[PDB]
């Protein structure tokens, strides 16, 4: 796909694993083998070897630079590069957008609506932050019932 070799069989990706441990191994040569800063570089090497063995096992595509490239078209092999964490993101981002929208409706029908935005009512906030879990069923539910959008006759419009 797109002229990119897989990273498990890429010679450039294995070259970057070789020259990263060798950079960290030469950093280890000036420390005692049981010393505290040498345990951090030894944990860095095992973090590096975990990283390169994770990138090759996920079917990542590596170019001529030896670097893993993401295919965001919507490929059946490449769902976890953009499509799977994008749907994970939009669920979380729609959770932020739904509990901030539902908080403003809950404080617009209050005695002092502007004091509830500088001082956020946490019992009112936390009872709808739980309610933002099921938000695609509540956003399209408000879209189908007409409560999501406001009619243009009740919207402040600058003159022509």
């Amino acid at each position: 796909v797109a002229g990119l070799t897989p990273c498990k069989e890429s010679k450039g990706f294995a070259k970057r694993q070789k020259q990263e441990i060798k950079k960290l191994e030469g950093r280890l040569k000036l420390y005692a083998p049981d010393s505290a800063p040498a345990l951090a570089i030894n944990a860095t090497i095992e973090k590096t070897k975990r990283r390169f063995e994770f990138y090759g096992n996920q079917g990542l595509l590596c170019g001529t630079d030896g670097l893993p490239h993401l295919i965001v078209d919507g490929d059946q092999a490449h769902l976890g590069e953009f499509v799977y964490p994008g749907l994970v993101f939009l669920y979380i981002a729609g959770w932020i957008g739904w509990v901030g929208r539902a908080y403003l409706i809950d404080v617009r029908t209050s005695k002092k609506p502007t004091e509830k935005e500088i001082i956020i009512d946490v019992p009112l906030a936390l009872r709808i932050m739980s309610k933002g879990l099921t938000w695609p069923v509540a956003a399209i539910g408000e879209l189908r019932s007409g409560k999501l959008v406001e009619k243009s006759s009740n919207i402040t419009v600058s003159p022509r």
Partner: protein, 164 residues
């Protein structure tokens, strides 16, 4: 207040040329190493007397030659100085957004954004406003001083750590 605001820029100009003259003057004529038989090799050997009289020397033998350790510090311990060098350029170019612009443009752009919020019933009761003209100048001079001072901080603390 606006004279304090402009004197903050002229303090940037004054103090930045002061510390630039300092860094080049002592990297060229003071700081260095002494080998055997009393020979002194400076960091940038003797180029303050000939290159710091032209702006091309200041751009070349100071702002380009000594910035050859803040930009290739990536992948090392001094790479946070490279990151804050670039992010300091970001904060400076972010300052030029607030300094060059004015309130009424941003107020009408915020009016369009408030219309998009009114369409989806997510209008806040605290009305979104553009920053004030004194506040827009304050934000611009704060990012200008922060970004430029952090640029000089990152370049200084990468160069003289690298050659020290």
């Amino acid at each position: 207040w606006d004279h304090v605001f402009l004197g903050l820029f002229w303090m940037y100009n004054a103090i930045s040329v002061v510390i630039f003259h300092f860094s080049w003057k002592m990297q060229s004529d003071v700081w260095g190493s002494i080998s055997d038989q009393g020979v002194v090799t400076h960091i940038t050997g003797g180029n303050f007397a000939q290159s710091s009289i032209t702006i091309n020397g200041w751009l070349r033998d100071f702002l380009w030659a000594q910035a050859s350790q803040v930009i290739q510090s990536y992948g090392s311990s001094l790479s946070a100085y490279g990151l804050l060098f670039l992010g300091a350029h970001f904060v400076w170019a972010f300052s030029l957004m607030f300094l060059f612009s004015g309130r009424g443009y941003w107020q009408e752009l915020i009016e369009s954004i408030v219309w998009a919020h009114n369409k989806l019933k997510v209008a806040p009761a605290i009305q979104p406003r553009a920053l004030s003209i004194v506040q827009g100048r304050a934000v611009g001079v704060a990012h200008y001083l922060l970004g430029g001072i952090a640029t000089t901080w990152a370049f200084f603390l990468a160069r003289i750590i690298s050659v020290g």
